Amino acid sequence: MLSGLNHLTLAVSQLAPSVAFYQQLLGMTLHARWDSGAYLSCGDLWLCLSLDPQRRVTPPEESDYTHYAFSISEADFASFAARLEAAGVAVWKLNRSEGASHYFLDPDGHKLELHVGSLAQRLAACREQPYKGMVFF
Amino acid sequence: MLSGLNHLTLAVSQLAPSVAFYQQLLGMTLHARWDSGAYLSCGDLWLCLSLDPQRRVTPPEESDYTHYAFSISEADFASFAARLEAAGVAVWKLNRSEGASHYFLDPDGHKLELHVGSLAQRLAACREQPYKGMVFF
Ligand SMILES: c1ccc2c(c1)CCNC2
Ligand SMILES: [Mn+2]
Ligand SMILES: [Mn+2]
What we know:
homodimer; 137 residues; 2,3-Dihydroxybiphenyl 1,2-Dioxygenase, domain 1; four-stranded mixed β-sheet; 3 helices; globular; binds 1,2,3,4-tetrahydroisoquinoline; binds manganese (II) ion
């Protein structure tokens, strides 16, 4: 039986700028780094950055909608989003189609998101403003 | 301040086979489905499947090392791997690291993993046998 996400591994093209992005800019905890990777945590999330010569810096119009959202409180959301904007972090989406979210890119174009709210809260919001064809189980 | 992973969204080329894979084969709970996506949970993980015509069915040689690992107990690992094998699910890598791992592909070629073990366990093993260039913080 599967019980959750054990870890997220992101391939990165340049290890040091990626470590800086996740640790310095996003505030995640850096536990270890080596010549070809790093281990970080974000709350209970284990994040692995893996130096991969195959990773390409990918513009958002070239990649699909696969993305990774990080939880933030309602009190912290706007100032964190505004700080990323002021720091020049690139974006990839503007329309809030799934609640209070800020969509931004990592240095390699991994699609990231700040989001306020749980799945339960999402489902409750969708009952009032459902997607097309939506069924709840 | 970021407090964890809020959700993982996978772009999928065909919604029905992806729902079958995550719900029926992998045993995740399906909470809602709409014409262009679905919401599932796996323990604390909120998974979103998003129907995306830009998703290519991608051979593993043509994608980078970015991947998503799910937690499973040691006791359940071998029978779950055998279930995936019986279903004909392709493997993209053999395990050569600490902790049991099974590296398998989803219908669109998303790189998945079953892993037994925490970040703390990995760090303890690395302290005893550090990777080349490893520094701890
Ligand atoms: C460094 C960074 C990430 C990973 C590994 C090593 C081995 C297991 N799969 C994930
Ligand atoms: Mn999202
Ligand atoms: Mn892994």
